[PDB]
Amino acid sequence: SAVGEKMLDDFEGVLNWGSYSGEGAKVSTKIVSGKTGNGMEVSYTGTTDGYWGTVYSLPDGDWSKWLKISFDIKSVANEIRFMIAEKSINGVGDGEHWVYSITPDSSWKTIEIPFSSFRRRLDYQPPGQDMSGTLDLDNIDSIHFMYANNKSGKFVVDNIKLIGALEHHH
Ligand SMILES: [Ca+2]
Ligand SMILES: [Ca+2]
Q1: How far apart are alpha carbons 85 and 95 in whole angstroms?
Q2: Which ligand is nearest to the CA of 94?
Q3: How far is the CA of 170 from the centre of ligand 1 (A)?
Q4: What is the CATH T-level fold of the domain 1-166, as seen in this structure?
């Protein structure tokens, strides 16, 4: 593993995130004040069968040198999911979905999730999933902030970054 970190989005540069929804649910995103400088506000309304999410599709899918994914989050409290999708076995589209549930609170908090802590999604898997039961870090398609339930809410994210190994002195 590599040491240190690699920033994916501090929201001070170009706009990278797209929105998607279906089956009654709705989502919208905008640039607002973040932890430092800019951040992205995600506003969602859920339905029983509805899905929503915001997605950054990655140009380079090889994350095999990294160990964790980190982000700052704050509510504007409803549970949501951070999701990592592998690349499809058919070449185009999303593959195996891997999830971690998080609940944004009133104050800014840093959430660091090791890749080994992600769980294989069971409510949905896309047709291009590899069914391997292992999160293949060398084959990453995209990252998502997405629905976990049928409820509504608003949150802000900032400082999305990869974390490698720490330099332990003892
Ligand atoms: Ca920022
Ligand atoms: Ca897999």
Answers
A1: 6
A2: 2
A3: 33
A4: Jelly Rolls (2.60.120)
